[PDB]
DNA sequence: CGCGAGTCGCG
DNA sequence: CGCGAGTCGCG
């Protein structure tokens, strides 16, 4: 399993679904050649450039961090969502960063015991971070470039 | 992830590399969004949609498995494949061996320009045959999907 | 990872 | 004018 990056005073920490698809499988987060997680961090402006997965410690510099909602074992249901959200949270209640961005809408619905949750800015928090429910990048995510970028941007101006 | 080979088969799938988990089990095609299963279901060449715990089964349809070769590959790669590819199927030689990838042949098999469908190359009797992969992350529609494979399954009678 | 694309750059 | 190119971007 991949292992976390994290730190104080971040903007961002870019939580994913299962703690991997190889996009794990490398040691490296979103490491699979089919997501776009880093070009969509580039072009939504949340880098300069659009970094490799061998370089996600460098998202450290951007003030950016990565990590994942849940932590063992193809499925991924109720079960290991709301376990993960729970480690999740104390996580995020220690770096306490300015703002959480879970990849997934149903992940964060269950996860998070929340429901009938709509894509964007949630009013639900932990401590002062903000929660925020963005599109996944992974390639099997129907969403198209566009709306993926346009997601992320929001939440980069929206931290100003 | 084995082969599930065996002679007298009808066709052997080939895939090409089971690095998206679809070999993460130990089982041929075995991530959730992979349509191998249900396209040969719909296909024909099964009766049912068997399950990628089930893949040994494919032999009593007269089916086997097989593939090509961390996330990515080489051209070096492919070719080797190739190689070791044909060998079995010299070995078992059964009607019709399917690729699961224009490229992949293309590469594999030192062939250029090729197109969807019945080859004219062979190995021995054994027909080639290139099917669009199953693949969630392949783009193609289940529709084309199923016809591609259901020709190929005609074809064999 | 596998797919489409052949219009575009060149002598 | 005809020819060759398929790597490149995308979900």
Redesign the interface.
């Known amino acids: 399993m991949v292992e976390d990056i994290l730190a104080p005073g971040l903007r961002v920490v870019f939580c994913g679904i299962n703690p991997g698809?190889?996009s794990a499988?490398?040691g490296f987060p979103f490491?699979?050649?089919?997501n776009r997680f880093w070009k969509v961090i580039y072009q939504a402006g949340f880098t300069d450039r659009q970094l490799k997965p061998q370089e996600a410690q460098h998202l450290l510099d951007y003030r950016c961090g990565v990590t994942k909602l849940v932590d063992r074992p193809?499925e991924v249901s109720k079960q290991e969502l709301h376990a993960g959200g729970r480690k999740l949270i104390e996580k995020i209640e220690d770096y306490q960063p300015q703002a959480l961005a879970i990849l997934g809408k149903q992940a964060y619905e269950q996860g998070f015991s929340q429901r009938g949750a709509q894509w964007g800015k949630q009013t639900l928090t932990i401590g002062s971070t903000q929660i925020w429910v963005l599109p996944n990048p992974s390639?099997?995510s129907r969403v198209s470039l566009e709306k993926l970028v346009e997601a992320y941007r929001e939440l980069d101006q929206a931290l100003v």
């Open positions: 698809l190889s499988g490398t490491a699979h050649p089919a193809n390639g099997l």
